């Protein structure tokens, strides 16, 4: 059902806010974006930029992905992002997360036509 493009937007885009509003941001968004439905996804980043800005990264600095594929791209600019990581304690179905807000470059893996992000590899 979901295009890798649309799944990326669900998992990784949050243009609704400029930054995490509280230390509960991740608890709340991991839940609302359906990333805790069946298990607690351990690590996930949200990007607070326009979709056009984040899709444009697919034409920026080509770098290898963590898995050694070559379709990753690092943003030329830093971007406002929230990094979510599950706490050591967390046990499903009660998923708990630490929220960290930062301005960093993102690295995404891109696919499709239009060529757009389908996976979030890392922030730098």
PDB file of C-alpha atoms in Angstrom, residues 57-115:
ATOM      1  CA  UNK A  57      18.990  16.311  -0.886  1.00  0.00           C
ATOM      2  CA  UNK A  58      18.715  13.476  -3.431  1.00  0.00           C
ATOM      3  CA  UNK A  59      20.636  15.807  -5.804  1.00  0.00           C
ATOM      4  CA  UNK A  60      23.286  16.900  -3.244  1.00  0.00           C
ATOM      5  CA  UNK A  61      26.461  15.154  -1.940  1.00  0.00           C
ATOM      6  CA  UNK A  62      26.582  11.519  -2.996  1.00  0.00           C
ATOM      7  CA  UNK A  63      27.967   9.291  -0.278  1.00  0.00           C
ATOM      8  CA  UNK A  64      27.872   5.608   0.553  1.00  0.00           C
ATOM      9  CA  UNK A  65      25.119   4.347   2.757  1.00  0.00           C
ATOM     10  CA  UNK A  66      25.869   2.401   5.975  1.00  0.00           C
ATOM     11  CA  UNK A  67      25.072  -0.797   4.094  1.00  0.00           C
ATOM     12  CA  UNK A  68      27.579   0.136   1.329  1.00  0.00           C
ATOM     13  CA  UNK A  69      24.902   0.899  -1.290  1.00  0.00           C
ATOM     14  CA  UNK A  70      25.760   4.037  -3.204  1.00  0.00           C
ATOM     15  CA  UNK A  71      22.369   5.816  -3.384  1.00  0.00           C
ATOM     16  CA  UNK A  72      22.788   7.928  -0.301  1.00  0.00           C
ATOM     17  CA  UNK A  73      23.070  11.673  -0.272  1.00  0.00           C
ATOM     18  CA  UNK A  74      24.201  14.130   2.428  1.00  0.00           C
ATOM     19  CA  UNK A  75      22.555  17.514   2.676  1.00  0.00           C
ATOM     20  CA  UNK A  76      24.706  20.493   1.895  1.00  0.00           C
ATOM     21  CA  UNK A  77      22.952  22.457   4.636  1.00  0.00           C
ATOM     22  CA  UNK A  78      22.260  21.615   8.282  1.00  0.00           C
ATOM     23  CA  UNK A  79      18.570  20.978   8.990  1.00  0.00           C
ATOM     24  CA  UNK A  80      16.435  21.146  12.121  1.00  0.00           C
ATOM     25  CA  UNK A  81      15.842  17.517  13.226  1.00  0.00           C
ATOM     26  CA  UNK A  82      14.622  15.566  16.308  1.00  0.00           C
ATOM     27  CA  UNK A  83      16.339  12.403  17.080  1.00  0.00           C
ATOM     28  CA  UNK A  84      14.275   9.752  18.957  1.00  0.00           C
ATOM     29  CA  UNK A  85      15.897   6.835  20.721  1.00  0.00           C
ATOM     30  CA  UNK A  86      14.240   4.209  22.833  1.00  0.00           C
ATOM     31  CA  UNK A  87      15.352   4.249  26.549  1.00  0.00           C
ATOM     32  CA  UNK A  88      17.090   1.149  27.999  1.00  0.00           C
ATOM     33  CA  UNK A  89      13.976   0.490  30.101  1.00  0.00           C
ATOM     34  CA  UNK A  90      11.407   0.644  27.431  1.00  0.00           C
ATOM     35  CA  UNK A  91       9.348  -2.494  26.889  1.00  0.00           C
ATOM     36  CA  UNK A  92       6.539  -2.790  24.348  1.00  0.00           C
ATOM     37  CA  UNK A  93       3.609  -2.024  24.517  1.00  0.00           C
ATOM     38  CA  UNK A  94       4.770   0.833  26.709  1.00  0.00           C
ATOM     39  CA  UNK A  95       7.382   2.429  24.361  1.00  0.00           C
ATOM     40  CA  UNK A  96       9.551   5.159  25.889  1.00  0.00           C
ATOM     41  CA  UNK A  97      12.008   7.537  24.092  1.00  0.00           C
ATOM     42  CA  UNK A  98      14.636  10.219  24.723  1.00  0.00           C
ATOM     43  CA  UNK A  99      14.171  13.295  22.582  1.00  0.00           C
ATOM     44  CA  UNK A 100      17.174  15.249  21.230  1.00  0.00           C
ATOM     45  CA  UNK A 101      16.705  18.354  19.071  1.00  0.00           C
ATOM     46  CA  UNK A 102      19.623  19.406  16.833  1.00  0.00           C
ATOM     47  CA  UNK A 103      20.777  21.172  13.670  1.00  0.00           C
ATOM     48  CA  UNK A 104      22.703  18.628  11.626  1.00  0.00           C
ATOM     49  CA  UNK A 105      23.233  17.432   8.059  1.00  0.00           C
ATOM     50  CA  UNK A 106      21.047  14.504   7.066  1.00  0.00           C
ATOM     51  CA  UNK A 107      21.976  11.496   4.941  1.00  0.00           C
ATOM     52  CA  UNK A 108      19.106   9.773   3.094  1.00  0.00           C
ATOM     53  CA  UNK A 109      18.822   6.971   0.602  1.00  0.00           C
ATOM     54  CA  UNK A 110      16.917   7.978  -2.516  1.00  0.00           C
ATOM     55  CA  UNK A 111      14.806   5.985  -5.014  1.00  0.00           C
ATOM     56  CA  UNK A 112      12.077   6.467  -7.627  1.00  0.00           C
ATOM     57  CA  UNK A 113      11.108   8.977 -10.232  1.00  0.00           C
ATOM     58  CA  UNK A 114      10.926  11.666  -8.973  1.00  0.00           C
ATOM     59  CA  UNK A 115      14.124  10.726  -7.150  1.00  0.00           C
TER      60      UNK A 115
END
